[PDB]
Amino acid sequence: GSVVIVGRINLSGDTAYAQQTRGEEGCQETSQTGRDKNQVEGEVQIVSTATQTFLATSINGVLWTVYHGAGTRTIASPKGPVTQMYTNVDKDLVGWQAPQGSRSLTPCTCGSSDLYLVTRHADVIPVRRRGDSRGSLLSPRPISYLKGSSGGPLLCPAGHAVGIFRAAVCTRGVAKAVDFIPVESLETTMRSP
Numbered sequence: 507g508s509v510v511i512v513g514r515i516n517l518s519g520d521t522a523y524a525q526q527t528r529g530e531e532g533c534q535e536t537s538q539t540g541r542d543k544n545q546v547e548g549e550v551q552i553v554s555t556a557t558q559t560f561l562a563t564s565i566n567g568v569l570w571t572v573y574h575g576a577g578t579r580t581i582a583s584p585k586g587p588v589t590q591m592y593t594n595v596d597k598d599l600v601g602w603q604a605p606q607g608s609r610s611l612t613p614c615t616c617g618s619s620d621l622y623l624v625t626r627h628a629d630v631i632p633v634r635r636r637g638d639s640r641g642s643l644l645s646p647r648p649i650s651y652l653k654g655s656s657g658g659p660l661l662c663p664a665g666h667a668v669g670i671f672r673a674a675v676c677t678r679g680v681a682k683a684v685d686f687i688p689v690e691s692l693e694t695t696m697r698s699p
C-alpha cells in the first residue's frame with residue numbers, strides 16, 4: 507500500500523494555512539493502486555498510511571518524511587506508485603522525488619537560534635535552538651498536540667528550512683523540546699551512494 511497525500515500546508519504567502527484535499531472513501535483505493543490524479547500544491551504535504559497521518563516537506567526538489575511514518579512505501583502519483591530515492595533508517599529519514607506543483611523550501615544558512623515548528627494544523631510554534639538536532643519549546647505543549655506532525659519543518663525567521671521534526675523530548679505527557687533532522691543531514695543523504 508502506497509502513502510497518500512490528503513492535504514497541504516502553504517508557507518509562501520503572509521498566512522500559513524492548511525487545506526484538506528482528500529476524504530476517507532478515496533484514500534484506500536488510491537493506496538492499493540498507488541494512482542492519485544489529484545493536483546499537488548504547497549511546501550508541506552499532509553500524508554496518510556492505513557490508519558496513521560503525518561507530514562512530508564519538500565526541500566531541494568525531494569519530498570522528505572520520517573521512516574517511522576512511511577516505512578519503505580511508495581507514494582501515490584498520477585502515473586502510479588513512486589519508489590523512494592532516499593532512505594536512512596538510522597536518521598529516520600525517507601525521500602521521494604517531489605511531485606509536480608510542490609514548491610521546495612530553501613535550506614537555512616544564516617545560522618539562527620530562533621526557530622519555528624510547523625504543525626499539521628499550520629500552527630507555527632516558536633523553538634529556541636539548543637544544539638545541532640535539538641530545540642526547546644518556548645511554551646511547553648502536551649505530547650497530544652504534536653502527534654501527527656513529524657516530517658514537518660523547523661523554520662528560521664526568514665522562512666528557510668532548518669530541519670525536519672522527528673521526535674519530542676517528553677516528560678510526563680509534556681513536550682519540553684523537539685528533536686529534528688538538520689537540513690545539513692539531508693544534503694549529506696542526497697550526496698552519498
Ligand SMILES: COc1cnc(O[C@@H]2C[C@@H](C(=O)N[C@]3(C(=O)NS(=O)(=O)C4CC4)C[C@H]3C(F)F)N(C(=O)[C@@H](NC(=O)OC(C)(C)C)C(C)(C)C)C2)c2cc(Cl)ccc12
Nearest residue numbers: 558560573574575595598652653654655656672673674675
Ligand atoms: C527509524 O528511526 C527512528 C524511529 N523512531 C524514532 O522516534 C520515535 C518516533 C517519534 C515520534 O513519535 N514522532 C512524533 C510524531 O508526531 N509522530 S507521528 O507523526 O505521530 C507518527 C505516527 C505517525 C514527533 C512526535 C510527536 F508525538 F511529539 N518518537 C518520539 O517522539 C519519542 N521521543 C523520543 O524518542 O525522544 C528522544 C529522541 C528525545 C529520546 C516519544 C517518547 C514521544 C514516543 C519515537 C526515532 C528517533 C530518533 Cl531521534 C532517531 C531515529 C528514530
Ligand SMILES: [Zn+2]
Nearest residue numbers: 614616662666
Ligand atoms: Zn535562515
